[PDB]
Design a protein around this ligand. Structure first.
Ligand SMILES: c1cc(-c2ccc3occc3c2)cc(N2CCNCC2)n1
Ligand SMILES: [Cl-]
Ligand SMILES: [Cl-]
Length: 330
């Protein structure tokens, strides 16, 4: 749509394409007023993309009018305007995403110490979105949506509030990227902020092993891969779940098992203990003898992840309590 050297509103000089999406495109631009580079998210001129981006602008503006040390893990929206019938969101410039970070390790993962630093910023971000007056569900947490502030540094910010909604402003049943999709969403149940904590648990394991924890090819495969690690979801959850029978079957004695198709490891036998290599020098034993990667370090990480991957969104660890976990104690 947009040429390099193009000048908008005697303010912005467009340089280059940063990214393309369902929603439109993101470009690098020079702001002559502030005298800084910015990222401009240009929404497509179609009602559907416009209406959803208006919700994104509303939630970012809501976050901005809250001044607390907790808010500075979210990309800053500087302002927005309409141009040639496109909603345009101006953000601060950030660096490359955590998926690019994994790609750069040849998908062998970053250290437990860098994983910790990412976890602690992300838990702080989730604590900020849980502030009662905000109550924002991100709904699309994944490595691609977490950007470094600076290519030299390990500071991060969350981007893409394109799917985000406040608690009790739910639009879509089908949300989150499949690998990072919570059991409650797979099961068609009303969702709350706990779905972001599920995504986070998936993301932290992937950041350390280099590979997605649950890489389903579709929803049925997704649930099967979760069940391989965590077992059959509790009956009290399956009993209240509209889509339980997409994946499971109830029995005379009030018990649930998998529906099987044509030929997974038996439920709960692919142990997070072995995926992390807690007692076998980390993922593929590639951390054998490295400092900050002792069995004790690994066990604390395992405990925190299993609390983030509670099937029950009610008892799943919440951001404040995740920040108090031993994994973050020096
Ligand atoms: C909002 C803002 C940004 C964003 C902000 C600042 C940035 O500095 C460099 C790249 C970049 C992207 C990216 C997106 N994205 C939405 C579409 N999925 C991909 C990410 N949304
Ligand atoms: Cl990925
Ligand atoms: Cl989504």
């Amino acid at each position: 749509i947009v040429k390099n050297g193009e000048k908008w509103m005697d303010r912005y000089e467009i340089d280059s394409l940063i990214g393309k999406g369902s929603f439109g495109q993101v470009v690098k631009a020079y702001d002559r007023v502030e005298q800084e580079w910015v990222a401009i998210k240009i929404i497509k001129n179609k009602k559907a993309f416009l209406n959803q981006a208006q919700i994104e602008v509303r939630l970012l503006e809501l976050m901005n009018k809250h001044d607390t040390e907790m808010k500075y893990y979210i990309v800053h929206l500087k302002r927005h305007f309409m141009f040639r019938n496109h909603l345009c969101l101006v953000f601060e410039m950030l660096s490359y995403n955590l998926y690019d970070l994994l790609r750069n390790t040849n998908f062998r993962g970053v250290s437990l110490n860098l994983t910790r630093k990412f976890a602690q910023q992300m838990c702080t971000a989730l604590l900020f979105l849980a502030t009662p007056e905000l109550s924002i569900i991100h709904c699309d947490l994944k490595p691609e949506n977490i950007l470094l502030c600076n290519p030299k540094r390990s500071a991060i910010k969350i981007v893409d509030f394109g799917s985000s909604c406040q608690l009790g402003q739910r639009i879509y049943q089908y949300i989150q990227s499949r690998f990072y999709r919570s059991p409650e969403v797979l099961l068609g149940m009303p969702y709350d902020l706990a779905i972001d904590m599920w995504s986070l648990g998936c993301i932290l394991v992937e950041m350390h092993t280099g590979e997605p924890l649950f890489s389903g090819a579709n929803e049925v495969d997704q649930m099967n891969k979760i069940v391989e690690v965590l077992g059959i979801p509790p009956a009290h959850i399956l009993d209240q779940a509209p889509k339980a029978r997409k994946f499971f079957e109830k029995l005379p004695d009030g018990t649930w098992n998998l529906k099987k198709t044509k030929d997974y490891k038996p439920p709960g036998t692919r142990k997070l203990h072995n995926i992390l290599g807690v007692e076998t020098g980390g993922p593929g034993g590639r951390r054998a003898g490295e400092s900050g990667h002792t069995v004790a370090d690994y066990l604390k990480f395992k405990d925190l992840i299993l609390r983030m991957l509670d099937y029950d969104p009610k008892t799943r660890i919440q951001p404040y309590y995740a920040l108090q976990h031993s994994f973050f104690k020096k």
